[PDB]
């Protein structure tokens, strides 16, 4: 009479059916990978890599497929924006079909390993009872894991046999799948240095092999064997749950903060690029350099790439989103069509005014136009009676350099107020919202959703470590206690 929450304990003491259920979970995961890839390819728009990349459309597995080398498709389109001459069998559709067929094969193998559960391999040769030599199993599977880690690091990513991984410029303007040379110096521990990824996966992998050869040759000591409850599968479950939630915390942190393994051309910008003005400073530095060359403001701003300006927009901030604001970023805000340009606000005196940008914390932010010396010179007041820094009172005009509105100046207060309100969000873009019926509230980029999901899983699996490990240590008393 097992309660509904204990049913899957039936395979605790059955190695064969444990293999079967683990095969079934593996088959389900592979099937989900294939199906998700197929759905994403079906609903993906590859026409415009600029202003409409993958992270704008809510793609979740496309970033990873592109990160590890798969770029082309059988539909004739490349994620980089070129033409697919010969995508080969390793296109997105190829990966989806492969993971799907693997899921089916694992389903069949699960059926078999379930029917023929009573294999003599799982019998203890001496006693004849069913038993698993957990130290030796860990040694074998760790040796395999280390071998695979070294192989992936040395051949893949380095491009010796594999294709490499996604490497981009610091500002995410020109990124592509490239081979990576390992970084053997201290800079190999720079999180944003790509060269660490091969070298690590090499060196660590090597250690794994050696570690395997130890945990496969040397039997654990009796004191350690009974202390760590080696020989109980639930102890292994507790330790594995702990390790996996540790890894989940690490990956969530490394994606929220960004690293060489989570490029912004695949997951979108981080919130710390908006907070610290990572792109705004670069744009203004390029503009200033062009001006120092003698160019006018219009030419200097026309020289700015549209993708770089698009990164400098608060709508792409992963932290400007909602828990139930579902779907693609294009579903909340319209599909980007073009860059309006750069708005320069100037009072009737000629003093240049800058619009205070919305911080990541604020859902709504009042519009303030600030002097170069940090002195508020204009605003859109909430109380139009006896206002002091009104747009009409100060006489603010907005001139657009570059983009769609190039060399266009607006002086009517309504248009100036509208454009200042738009510019408080960063660079101003035109959005087509009729196509997807965008409501008008920002969604979160795929890196935000990934971080949220895997952080919640990390917490729940910390509770899993606690529970399954308590059950491990207190196995004798978890069938009941004999009073004191």
């Amino acid at each position: 009479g097992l309660p509904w929450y204990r049913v899957h304990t039936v395979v605790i003491n059955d190695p064969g059916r444990l293999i079967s259920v683990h095969l079934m979970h593996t088959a389900l995961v592979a099937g989900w990978a294939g199906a998700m890839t197929l759905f994403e390819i079906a609903v993906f728009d590859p026409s415009d890599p600029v202003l409409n990349p993958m992270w704008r459309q809510g793609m979740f597995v496309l970033p990873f497929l592109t990160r590890l080398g798969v770029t082309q498709s059988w539909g004739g389109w490349t994620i980089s924006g070129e033409t697919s001459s010969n995508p080969g069998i390793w296109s997105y559709e190829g990966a989806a079909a492969s993971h799907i067929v693997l899921s089916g094969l694992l389903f069949l193998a699960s059926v078999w390993h379930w029917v023929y559960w009573d294999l003599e391999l799982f019998r203890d040769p001496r006693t004849g009872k069913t038993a698993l030599d957990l130290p030796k199993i860990f040694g074998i599977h760790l040796f395999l894991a280390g071998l695979l880690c070294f192989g992936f690091g040395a051949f893949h990513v380095t491009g010796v046999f594999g294709p490499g991984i996604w490497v981009s410029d610091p500002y995410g303007l020109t990124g592509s799948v490239q081979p990576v040379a390992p970084s053997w110096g201290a800079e190999g521990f720079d999180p944003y240095n790509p060269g660490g990824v091969p070298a690590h996966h090499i060196a660590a992998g090597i250690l794994g092999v050696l570690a395997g050869l130890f945990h496969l040759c040397v039997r654990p000591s009796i004191r350690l064997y009974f202390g760590l409850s080696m020989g109980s599968i639930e102890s292994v479950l507790s330790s594995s749950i702990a390790a996996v939630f540790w890894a989940a915390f690490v990956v969530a942190g490394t994606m929220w903060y960004g690293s060489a393994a989570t490029p912004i051309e695949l997951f979108g910008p981080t919130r710390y690029q908006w907070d610290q003005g990572f792109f705004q400073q670069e744009i203004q530095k390029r503009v200033a350099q062009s001006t120092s060359e003698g160019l006018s403001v219009s030419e200097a701003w026309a020289k700015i790439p549209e993708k770089l300006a698009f990164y400098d927009y608060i709508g792409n901030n992963p932290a400007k989103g909602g828990l139930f604001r579902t779907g693609a970023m294009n579903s909340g805000d319209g599909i980007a069509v073009g860059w309006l340009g750069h708005a320069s606000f100037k009072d009737q005196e000629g003093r240049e005014l800058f619009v205070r940008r919305m911080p990541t914390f604020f859902e709504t932010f009042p519009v303030v136009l600030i002097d170069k010396d940090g002195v508020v010179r204009a605003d859109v007041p909430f109380r139009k009676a006896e206002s002091k820094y009104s747009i009409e009172q100060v006489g603010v005009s907005v001139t657009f350099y570059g983009g769609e509105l190039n060399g266009l100046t607006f002086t009517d207060p309504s248009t100036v107020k509208k454009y200042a309100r738009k510019a408080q969000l960063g660079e101003i873009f035109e959005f087509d919202r009729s196509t997807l019926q965008s409501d008008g509230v920002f969604r979160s980029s795929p890196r935000g959703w990934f971080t949220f999901g895997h952080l919640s899983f990390a917490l729940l699996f910390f509770f899993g470590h606690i529970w399954h490990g308590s059950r491990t240590i207190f196995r004798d008393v978890f069938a009941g206690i004999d009073e004191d």
Binding site: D275, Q276, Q280, A288, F354, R356, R357, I370, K372
Partner: peptide, 28 residues
């Protein structure tokens, strides 16, 4: 030739939290 002082004085009004302002702030 870029005027770093003007660059900082442009970033500060739009965003005071910019890394341009905070870097070498005690020097200012």
């Amino acid at each position: 030739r870029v005027r770093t002082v003007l660059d900082m004085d442009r970033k500060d009004p739009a965003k005071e939290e910019t890394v341009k302002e905070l870097r070498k702030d005690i020097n200012n």
